[PDB]
Write a protein that binds this ligand. Structure first.
Ligand SMILES: Oc1c(C[NH+]2CCOCC2)ccc2ccccc12
Ligand SMILES: *[C@@H]1O[C@H](CO)[C@@H](O)[C@H](O)[C@H]1NC(C)=O
Length: 339
């Protein structure tokens, strides 16, 4: 169980103005995993109002429970988490509906607050007083919108710790199911463009400088923002991601067969030069906090093993690979895919 702490700076809020927060389980014998929850987003007054009605835990802390059970990479049991079972564990709930990009308070012109980028900054600052000041490695991880959130925020956390005087903490990222293609749909980007303006969204500075004003939406797509990042980032992405297919209007004859095979090939291509990555040929979505995340393998290597090999590479390795991408071209051509 991880224990809830609401932020002491009550000006850093969820969408409805309630305080944001984090769930923490300390491990005093260890020198930190900070996980960003996902859950889509909203981009105007009308669809944010709908989300407040039936997805309110993603917009408010008013009904959060006092504890959460750590699962998958957040579990403290070696049988469930061979990778980092002894680490300090943090779960940051997603209550800003902005893909963790926003920096805008609720005001007399704004019905909702969109503060995802500032929530991450404030969690880091308050954790430094609870033990993070002594850390050797801070791994910023996340699933779905939280995985895109890692890509948008990992270099800002690194800069924050450097400016605060902690140059010895190594900041790294782990992006799960947050690597999308802005491709042609099977049946018939504007929502991101509108969302960024609604949220006052912020993107990493080197990427912003490349694409310039009005084109910041580009930095939400992994294959465009990743080359601009300085922190080490491990990318986990199913080749046939269910959220990607939903946006593509896919739910089998020749036209759809070719569409699906082309999607897998394009995703494989975007990862060819990503040295730390794990990309199985499965139809699924998210994995790192699922309890059975230890089951899937690529070329004989599990995801917990690949992450352990990544740790060793940051001190190629014999029998300990870090770049693992399936080549077979159809969902479940990998026998270890989730049923
Ligand atoms: O915008 C898209 C997404 C989701 N976006 C959400 C926010 O961050 C980045 C990805 C997924 C598939 C898409 C396919 C084609 C065009 C746009 C797409
Ligand atoms: C609380 O957070 C806001 C927004 O980031 C910031 O402007 C303010 O300085 C913070 N308060 C303190 C005491 O640091």
């Amino acid at each position: 169980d991880l224990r809830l702490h609401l932020l002491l700076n009550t000006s850093v809020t969820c969408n409805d103005g309630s305080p944001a927060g984090y769930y923490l389980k300390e491990s005093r014998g260890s020198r930190w995993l900070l996980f960003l929850e996902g859950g889509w987003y909203c981009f105007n007054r009308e669809n944010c109002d709908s989300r407040y009605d039936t997805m309110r835990r993603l917009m408010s802390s008013r009904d959060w429970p006092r504890t959460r059970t750590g699962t998958g990479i957040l579990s403290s049991q070696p049988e469930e988490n061979p990778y980092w079972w002894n680490a300090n564990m943090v779960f940051i709930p997603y209550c800003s509906s902005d893909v963790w990009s926003g920096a805008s308070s609720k005001s007399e012109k704004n019905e909702y607050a969109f503060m995802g980028a500032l929530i991450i900054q404030e969690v880091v600052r308050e954790l430094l007083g609870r033990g993070l000041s002594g850390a050797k490695v801070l791994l910023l991880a996340g699933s779905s919108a939280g995985g895109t959130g890692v890509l948008l925020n990992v270099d800002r956390v690194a800069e924050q710790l450097e400016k605060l005087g902690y140059p010895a903490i190594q900041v790294r990222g782990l992006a799960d199911s947050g690597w999308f293609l802005d491709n042609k749909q099977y049946r018939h980007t504007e929502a991101i463009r509108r969302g960024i303006r609604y949220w006052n969204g912020v993107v990493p500075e080197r990427c912003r400088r490349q694409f310039q004003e009005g084109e910041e939406w580009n930095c939400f797509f992994g294959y465009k923002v990743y080359p601009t990042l300085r922190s080490p980032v491990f990318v986990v992405q199913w080749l046939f991601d269910e959220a990607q297919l939903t946006v593509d209007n896919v739910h089998v004859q020749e036209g759809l067969r070719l569409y699906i095979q082309n999607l897998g090939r394009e995703l494989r291509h975007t990862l060819k030069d990503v040295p730390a990555s794990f990309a199985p040929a499965c139809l699924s979505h998210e994995i790192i906090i699922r309890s059975h995340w230890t089951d899937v393998q690529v070329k004989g290597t599990s995801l917990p093993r690949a992450l352990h090999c990544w740790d060793r590479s940051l001190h190629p390795l014999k029998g300990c690979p870090v770049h693992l991408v399936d080549s077979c071209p159809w969902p479940h051509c990998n026998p270890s895919c989730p049923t």
